[PDB]
Amino acid sequence: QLFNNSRSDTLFLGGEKISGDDIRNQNVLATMAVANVVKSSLGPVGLDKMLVDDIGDFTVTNDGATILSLLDVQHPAGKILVELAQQQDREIGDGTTSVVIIASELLKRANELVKNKIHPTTIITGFRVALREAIRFINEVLSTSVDTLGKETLINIAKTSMSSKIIGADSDFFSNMVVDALLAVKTQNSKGEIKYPVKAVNVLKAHGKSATESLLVPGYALNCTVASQAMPKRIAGGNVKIACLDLNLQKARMAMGVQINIDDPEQLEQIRKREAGIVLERVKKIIDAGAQVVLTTKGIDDLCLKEFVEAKIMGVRRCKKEDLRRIARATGATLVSSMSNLEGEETFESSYLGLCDEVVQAKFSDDECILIKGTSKHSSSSIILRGANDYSLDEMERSLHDSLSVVKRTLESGNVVPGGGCVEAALNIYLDNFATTVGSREQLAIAEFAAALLIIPKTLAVNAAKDSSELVAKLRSYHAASQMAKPEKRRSYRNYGLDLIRGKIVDEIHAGVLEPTISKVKSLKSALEACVAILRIDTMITVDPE
Amino acid sequence: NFGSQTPTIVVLKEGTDASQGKGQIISNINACVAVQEALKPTLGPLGSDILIVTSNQKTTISNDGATILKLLDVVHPAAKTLVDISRAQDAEVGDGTTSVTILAGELMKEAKPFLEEGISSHLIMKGYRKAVSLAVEKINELAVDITSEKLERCARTAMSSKLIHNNADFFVKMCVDAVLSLDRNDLDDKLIGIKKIPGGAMEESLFINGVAFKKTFSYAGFEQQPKKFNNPKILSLNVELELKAEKDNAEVRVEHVEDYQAIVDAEWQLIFEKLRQVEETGANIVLSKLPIGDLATQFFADRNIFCAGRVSADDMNRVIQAVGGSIQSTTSDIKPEHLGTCALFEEMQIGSERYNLFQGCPQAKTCTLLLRGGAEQVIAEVERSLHDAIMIVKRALQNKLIVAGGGATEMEVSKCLRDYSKTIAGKQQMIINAFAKALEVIPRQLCENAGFDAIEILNKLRLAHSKGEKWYGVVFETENIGDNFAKFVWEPALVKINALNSATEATNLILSVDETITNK
Amino acid sequence: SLRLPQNPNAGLFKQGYNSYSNADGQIIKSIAAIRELHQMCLTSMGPCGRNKIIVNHLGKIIITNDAATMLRELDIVHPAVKVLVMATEQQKIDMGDGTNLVMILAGELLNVSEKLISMGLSAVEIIQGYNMARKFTLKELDEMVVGEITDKNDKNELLKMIKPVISSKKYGSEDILSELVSEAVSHVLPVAQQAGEIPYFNVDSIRVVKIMGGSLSNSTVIKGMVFNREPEGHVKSLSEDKKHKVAVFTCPLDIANTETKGTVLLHNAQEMLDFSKGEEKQIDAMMKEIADMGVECIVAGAGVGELALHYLNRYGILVLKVPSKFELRRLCRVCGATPLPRLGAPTPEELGLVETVKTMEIGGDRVTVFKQEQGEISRTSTIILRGATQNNLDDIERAIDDGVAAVKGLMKPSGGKLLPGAGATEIELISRITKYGERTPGLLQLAIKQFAVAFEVVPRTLAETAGLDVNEVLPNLYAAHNVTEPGAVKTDHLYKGVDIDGESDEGVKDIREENIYDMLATKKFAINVATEAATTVLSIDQIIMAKK
Amino acid sequence: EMGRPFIIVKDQGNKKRQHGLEAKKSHILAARSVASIIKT
Numbered sequence A: 001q002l003f004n005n006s007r008s009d010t011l012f013l014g015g016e017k018i019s020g021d022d023i024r025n026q027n028v029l030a031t032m033a034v035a036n037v038v039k040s041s042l043g044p045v046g047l048d049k050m051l052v053d054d055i056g057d058f059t060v061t062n063d064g065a066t067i068l069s070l071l072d073v074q075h076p077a078g079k080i081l082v083e084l085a086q087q088q089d090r091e092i093g094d095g096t097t098s099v100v101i102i103a104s105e106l107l108k109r110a111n112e113l114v115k116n117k118i119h120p121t122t123i124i125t126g127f128r129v130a131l132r133e134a135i136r137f138i139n140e141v142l143s144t145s146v147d148t149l150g151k152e153t154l155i156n157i158a159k160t161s162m163s164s165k166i167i168g169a170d171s172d173f174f175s176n177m178v179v180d181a182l183l184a185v186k187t188q189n190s191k192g193e194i195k196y197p198v199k200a201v202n203v204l205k206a207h208g209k210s211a212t213e214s215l216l217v218p219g220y221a222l223n224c225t226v227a228s229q230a231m232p233k234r235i236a237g238g239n240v241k242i243a244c245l246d247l248n249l250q251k252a253r254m255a256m257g258v259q260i261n262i263d264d265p266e267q268l269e270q271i272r273k274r275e276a277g278i279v280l281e282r283v284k285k286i287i288d289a290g291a292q293v294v295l296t297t298k299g300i301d302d303l304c305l306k307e308f309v310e311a312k313i314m315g316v317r318r319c320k321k322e323d324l325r326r327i328a329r330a331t332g333a334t335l336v337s338s339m340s341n342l343e344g345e346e347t348f349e350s351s352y353l354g355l356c357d358e359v360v361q362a363k364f365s366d367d368e369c370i371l372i373k374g375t376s377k378h379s380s381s382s383i384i385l386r387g388a389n390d391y392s393l394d395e396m397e398r399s400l401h402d403s404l405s406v407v408k409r410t411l412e413s414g415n416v417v418p419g420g421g422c423v424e425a426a427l428n429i430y431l432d433n434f435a436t437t438v439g440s441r442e443q444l445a446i447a448e449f450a451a452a453l454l455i456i457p458k459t460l461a462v463n464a465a466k467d468s469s470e471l472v473a474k475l476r477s478y479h480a481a482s483q484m485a486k487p488e489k490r491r492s493y494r495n496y497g498l499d500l501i502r503g504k505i506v507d508e509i510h511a512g513v514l515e516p517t518i519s520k521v522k523s524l525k526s527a528l529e530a531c532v533a534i535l536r537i538d539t540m541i542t543v544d545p546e
Numbered sequence B: 001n002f003g004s005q006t007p008t009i010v011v012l013k014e015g016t017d018a019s020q021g022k023g024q025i026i027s028n029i030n031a032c033v034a035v036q037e038a039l040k041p042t043l044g045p046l047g048s049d050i051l052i053v054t055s056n057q058k059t060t061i062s063n064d065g066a067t068i069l070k071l072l073d074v075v076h077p078a079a080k081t082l083v084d085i086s087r088a089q090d091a092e093v094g095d096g097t098t099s100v101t102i103l104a105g106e107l108m109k110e111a112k113p114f115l116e117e118g119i120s121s122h123l124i125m126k127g128y129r130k131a132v133s134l135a136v137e138k139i140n141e142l143a144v145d146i147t148s149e150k151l152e153r154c155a156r157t158a159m160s161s162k163l164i165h166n167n168a169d170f171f172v173k174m175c176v177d178a179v180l181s182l183d184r185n186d187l188d189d190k191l192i193g194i195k196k197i198p199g200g201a202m203e204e205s206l207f208i209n210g211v212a213f214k215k216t217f218s219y220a221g222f223e224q225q226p227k228k229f230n231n232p233k234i235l236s237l238n239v240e241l242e243l244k245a246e247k248d249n250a251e252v253r254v255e256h257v258e259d260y261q262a263i264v265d266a267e268w269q270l271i272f273e274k275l276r277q278v279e280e281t282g283a284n285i286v287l288s289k290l291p292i293g294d295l296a297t298q299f300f301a302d303r304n305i306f307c308a309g310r311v312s313a314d315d316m317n318r319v320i321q322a323v324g325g326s327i328q329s330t331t332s333d334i335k336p337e338h339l340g341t342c343a344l345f346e347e348m349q350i351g352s353e354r355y356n357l358f359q360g361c362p363q364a365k366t367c368t369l370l371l372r373g374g375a376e377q378v379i380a381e382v383e384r385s386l387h388d389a390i391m392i393v394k395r396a397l398q399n400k401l402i403v404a405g406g407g408a409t410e411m412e413v414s415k416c417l418r419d420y421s422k423t424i425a426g427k428q429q430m431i432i433n434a435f436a437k438a439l440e441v442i443p444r445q446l447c448e449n450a451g452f453d454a455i456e457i458l459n460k461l462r463l464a465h466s467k468g469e470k471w472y473g474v475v476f477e478t479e480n481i482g483d484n485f486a487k488f489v490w491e492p493a494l495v496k497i498n499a500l501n502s503a504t505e506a507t508n509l510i511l512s513v514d515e516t517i518t519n520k
Numbered sequence C: 001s002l003r004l005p006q007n008p009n010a011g012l013f014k015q016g017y018n019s020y021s022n023a024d025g026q027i028i029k030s031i032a033a034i035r036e037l038h039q040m041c042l043t044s045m046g047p048c049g050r051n052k053i054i055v056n057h058l059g060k061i062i063i064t065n066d067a068a069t070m071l072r073e074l075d076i077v078h079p080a081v082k083v084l085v086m087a088t089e090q091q092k093i094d095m096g097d098g099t100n101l102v103m104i105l106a107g108e109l110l111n112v113s114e115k116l117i118s119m120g121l122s123a124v125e126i127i128q129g130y131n132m133a134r135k136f137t138l139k140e141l142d143e144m145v146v147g148e149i150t151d152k153n154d155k156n157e158l159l160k161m162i163k164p165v166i167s168s169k170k171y172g173s174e175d176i177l178s179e180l181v182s183e184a185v186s187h188v189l190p191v192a193q194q195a196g197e198i199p200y201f202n203v204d205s206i207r208v209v210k211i212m213g214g215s216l217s218n219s220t221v222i223k224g225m226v227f228n229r230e231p232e233g234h235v236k237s238l239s240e241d242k243k244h245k246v247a248v249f250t251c252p253l254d255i256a257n258t259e260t261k262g263t264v265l266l267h268n269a270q271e272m273l274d275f276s277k278g279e280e281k282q283i284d285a286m287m288k289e290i291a292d293m294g295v296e297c298i299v300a301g302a303g304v305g306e307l308a309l310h311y312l313n314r315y316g317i318l319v320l321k322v323p324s325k326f327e328l329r330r331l332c333r334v335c336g337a338t339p340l341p342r343l344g345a346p347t348p349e350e351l352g353l354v355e356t357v358k359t360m361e362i363g364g365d366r367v368t369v370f371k372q373e374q375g376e377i378s379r380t381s382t383i384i385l386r387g388a389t390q391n392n393l394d395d396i397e398r399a400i401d402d403g404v405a406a407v408k409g410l411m412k413p414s415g416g417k418l419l420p421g422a423g424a425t426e427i428e429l430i431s432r433i434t435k436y437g438e439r440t441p442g443l444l445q446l447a448i449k450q451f452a453v454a455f456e457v458v459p460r461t462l463a464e465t466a467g468l469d470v471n472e473v474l475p476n477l478y479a480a481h482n483v484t485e486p487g488a489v490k491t492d493h494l495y496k497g498v499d500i501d502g503e504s505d506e507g508v509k510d511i512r513e514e515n516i517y518d519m520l521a522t523k524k525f526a527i528n529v530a531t532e533a534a535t536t537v538l539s540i541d542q543i544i545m546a547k548k
Numbered sequence D: 001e002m003g004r005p006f007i008i009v010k011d012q013g014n015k016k017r018q019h020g021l022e023a024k025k026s027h028i029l030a031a032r033s034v035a036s037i038i039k040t
């Protein structure tokens, strides 16, 4: 800002070194420049944004995780929120939009706190002491997953994640698909602990029909093409055996770097015939075992295709390594890298073959996929998305991916908190009376931390093209009276949030908006570490490349 | 249809900027805050100064909000509003130009989080226009009639933040008698004029009852004229005394050689005729705007009559008021009663420059000071402090009012505004309480330049307004906070009145503009 | 296949010439080009309208919300936009009122025409739809008029005319800006009631002097003209009163010079000795006749020589410099004097009367006070305008001129003819044209019904700029007009209008108490110019440009 | 910066600004260079 500083007077540096308040001023502008994007994308009233690669392709991404990933930011402090948005996907998987706005606001309001001459250690302590009481307050206001007789939770859990997305209007239809997909892919480990392998549900891209007609596949759907067209396209009957092999079925050279030297010319043909015969020995054991479908990681040579057509076996080549591991557990088959055992003999055992109800290959809009349904050993699920184009399905692919991570946190930990600015507004009133007790120089730091969390509920009303004050002023009326609501349920005054469609304050429990409690704990801790690292930088030194 | 190109018509000419979107009005706020960043450390007597060098390599050191903005050329449309309020505050009152820009920029900074919300642009201006109405009426309660006690205190506080402030035990004594020589309803701004002499020490300056001007020209008969007069008579003349064509045209037609000699002798007699009429009236000093050749100067040397020329029109206007004389554009109308006089006339050399000293007149409205200093800016900063200090005691003669300074004004006005926001609205209460905190930037930033803790000061200001009443303010010497009435620090009310009206008008102007178009 | 034929026989015209026709969506692009500058003036409409900053090539900044002033400095490219630009300038010159209405109304007629063209309506049928609907619109404005100004000058009545006009331009405080303009109007009125004389008014009579510094509350009204001038010889407060006799000379004061080859001719030294004293007796003889008539002040129109200024200081006569022309012309209207070129003794009947002439410091410089008093009234009064920023001083000067132009509307027609304000004028026309569209059989009813839809922009703009939802507020206003008229007379529902902020939900009860009204003479030409502006764009099937 | 050129004063990049301790150190060393010349 203003005029550039002089370059290394008596300092004798080859790069640029700026000191004073100019560093902290540019550090705030770094977080404010990347925030103005994420800001307008927050809430159900948020709008998608389009990023262009200048090569002719566009990318529509609502959340700030991929937006900050695609946008190149060369500012040293600007890369913190870029890595923070990429981080939020790793732990929780959702909240990349809220973690960037909060972390940018913690630094924004702290820019006026350093003008007071307050040292950052007082500012950092004021944010940490207020955070320790904030995490404890969230655990006190949480609600149990019991609620009424029926579940009435997991359906509402997905509807919160479906907000801010184009499919948000269809969230009523996609609510039952996400819940039924995660419950089928559940596993068990740690002697009774249930785990949820996110990404195990296949997301397929199809064109035509509509997103409301997308059918949930009761099983795994493999994306690939049939080896030979002479194979039967549909396989019926119960107990369908599936073979998953990681070994090359194509003819390969002998050993690796050896050399074949032949003296007697009569053996020139017999040696070459054996190289092609060894490959078909592994196929003969598969045909005699009764395997209907043969899944191979690598390609399949024409020598192995003639044996599958005559035996009415469906061959599949060029399979992903991560895709076949999920097929083995679901169908019950054991992954076979090679045919061998402890004994010196080589044979194929029928126990390595899986079982399912039906194997059929479906073709819709140039997309060919084999539908494996009715797995007896372990159930699975797959979702086939239908939309305008591939880029229209790119946002729908990440929309359902974020919904799988939100439901996972509610099943592991049944503690949930209401959305719509309930947590951010409740922490303000709790920290107002707490700051008056400490006093001294930490009272202003805690007061600004409670006001910094107000950016989330205020962003909802700004993006809705409505009056923000009347919504926030009435919002505080319930939360300010909630701390003074006093014991005796008749308490109420809590779990209230903004309704952006109707412009009223209603109960979020009856509205069907809930958010995992762990999502609030990991977001406030990750957003603070981004602000603490920036407030501690006195001088930025940029060395020119050689 | 005339070509396969078929260009697309653009509404605006190429080179025009864009607007609307989000952040266009925010761009105007950050432009004013960045300008405010330079003027904040210059606030307060312990504040610093800013060194500015223009494209002409002209060194100027100023902490004044008006002078700093005149040096830099501001091409930003919204940032030029701070320049207008700085020049408007300096024109009338002359003081507070730095405080107006700091206050006007803070009103935009406190309105920045309101624009990001759903608050309309006109709703914010409703808070500032209503609060300034009750703020002006609050200043009238701060001020006192002070018809009792009969310039000394207000002139010392005006020199703060600027040079010679520590010398106020000296220069202030000259500022008191400077404006007192000016009668009511006149109060001429030229008669207080001050001349700058490069070189010397500023403590060697002295007070003069009349104008002193530079000769700017060396006459061949100058030294033959006495430089010390016991009872001089000053005569102001617009005539031009020398040998030259008379009026606007020169031509001569002479047929005979005998008549050719009379033409030359006639030119000498006409020029000498104007010289004899001056001697018959006994005028010891002759001043003229038009040049005067060595012919008229040497004639005045034998008669012991002082002669001068080249004097600017602004300096001779001070001569008529100093000696009570009159301007005579012809030598035939000179009468004895139109000549002024004084007690004595002595020519003293100051910094290799000789000046004419007019002093000792019974009644003189002219005040001219001779300033010295090492740097060329030192002599400029002193007059810059004296010119601003005279306008403070100038406005005090029309109305005598005292308002406690040192942040005591903004804290008392903001107290009654928080009570007004408590009684009514609640939609506007967020804006009014923001205006009360926006007035606190003046006492907060003024205490940051002294290195004192702002938290300890501001916390002790708010709770102390019960027993402190209106006069409770900050004390620099004892590092404590105590009544400024006992500290004698005073200040007129006209400084704070124009400061609140200029900051509100400049803030509401930009908040009402959401679009800025720049052609070419 | 690699390169196009690139429009063969295109060499008939220069490469800079381009052809644009109503076909190929260019008539839609022309309407879309209007919306670029249309939204600029939408946020500037009403008392809550937002001013705009426009920087020209010379660096001058003019901050105003007036559509006619903003379009002057902007460089326009699209030809049909200049039709809309020059249409708003005529409204400011003619009536001096309703400039933002012509800009918005003419732009909305093209927006509703985009749907009319898409349905297949020819350009001829669309023009006939607006012309027949405008004739019915002008007839309904005279039926809906309420109240009248009656007497020319009144203290209260001038608050129902100038005040609602200046409320949109630099709103600020209401009664502060209304009293300054209303005071200067009462001085320039000849009054002379019961005499039956024809009233007269001049829009250039009231002059606004921009002086930086101070505050708006410190402004006042001066009956005389105020200039920045420095008296030459001396300054005089003229406390000896008994008024004064003043004379005005459009010619400079100096010895008369021959227009051809002015030269001093001296044959002998005898004529040279009397040449210096000869010119001194000429000015003495001429200025003595003026001083004998009791003339204490002389107004000069050019540079005055020093020899002439000497004798003027002898008798204590003030000297005034009036450069150019118009500055000196309005000086004689104040004192009622007749200029004469000669330097001789003026006629006593042509001498003016000014009681006091004062010189004081206002904005830091010496200004001369021509202010008049209760008796011997004067015309062309000036208004001292104090402000912190010069940018605000420019638009307030145009805001006062809007109030001065509103006084002109009280002269030519039979009366003021007040109309309901707050957008109630354009809303009532919607229900009347809707009934008029049904009474006309044929296909012309499509353009007539959509002509009333364009009037919905006035309530939507006032509601949007006020921070209110146009979906909640606008339909609630039709509830007053949907009940039509009852079985009894005296229906006050015509006073319903749009409210700014506050409690919303319609509001301001009946605007009769708010006193804000509109001028009928302004709405007559505002609709005619805006209709012809949109008609001209729709009547052009092909547009041709040069060099670009 | 938000993507638009921000210029408060003409000749932005031409003029430089010094502040803090570095501005005071440059002023003292400027006098030391003049002093050591005059001290000889």
Ligand SMILES: Nc1ncnc2c1ncn2[C@@H]1O[C@H](COP(=O)(O)OP(=O)(O)O)[C@@H](O)[C@H]1O
Pocket (backbone or CB within 6 Å): A041, A042, A043, A044, A063, A094, A095, A096, A097, A098, A159, A160, A161, A162, A163, A164, A418, A419, A420, A421, A422, A497, A498, A499, A500, A513
């Ligand atoms: N139906 C709803 N009503 C009100 N608020 C909601 C609703 N759905 C989500 N929100 C709020 O929007 C915020 C963002 O939600 P979401 O879009 O799921 O995360 P992200 O914005 O990180 O993708 C949450 O904090 C939540 O409080």
Ligand SMILES: Nc1ncnc2c1ncn2[C@@H]1O[C@H](COP(=O)(O)OP(=O)(O)O)[C@@H](O)[C@H]1O
Pocket (backbone or CB within 6 Å): B042, B043, B044, B045, B064, B065, B095, B096, B097, B098, B099, B100, B157, B158, B159, B160, B161, B162, B404, B405, B406, B407, B446, B474, B476, B489
């Ligand atoms: N001796 C003093 N004690 C306390 N406060 C002072 C003193 N001198 C000046 N101030 C305060 O400093 C502020 C700025 O004064 P000044 O420098 O004259 O104006 P500016 O800063 O606009 O140039 C004033 O508002 C005044 O209250």
Ligand SMILES: Nc1ncnc2c1ncn2[C@@H]1O[C@H](COP(=O)(O)OP(=O)(O)O)[C@@H](O)[C@H]1O
Pocket (backbone or CB within 6 Å): C045, C046, C047, C096, C097, C098, C099, C100, C101, C164, C165, C167, C168, C169, C402, C420, C421, C422, C423, C497, C498, C499, C500, C516, C517, C518
């Ligand atoms: N306080 C108010 N309340 C309601 N309506 C108003 C108010 N002030 C002005 N208006 C309306 O807004 C309109 C603005 O007119 P405008 O186009 O600005 O005229 P001009 O362009 O001549 O200044 C006026 O016709 C008036 O009826």
Ligand SMILES: [Mg+2]
Pocket (backbone or CB within 6 Å): A094, A095, A161, A402
């Ligand atoms: Mg989300």
Ligand SMILES: [Mg+2]
Pocket (backbone or CB within 6 Å): B095, B096, B158, B160, B161
């Ligand atoms: Mg000062």
Ligand SMILES: [Mg+2]
Pocket (backbone or CB within 6 Å): C097, C098, C164, C165, C166, C168, C169, C402
């Ligand atoms: Mg108007």
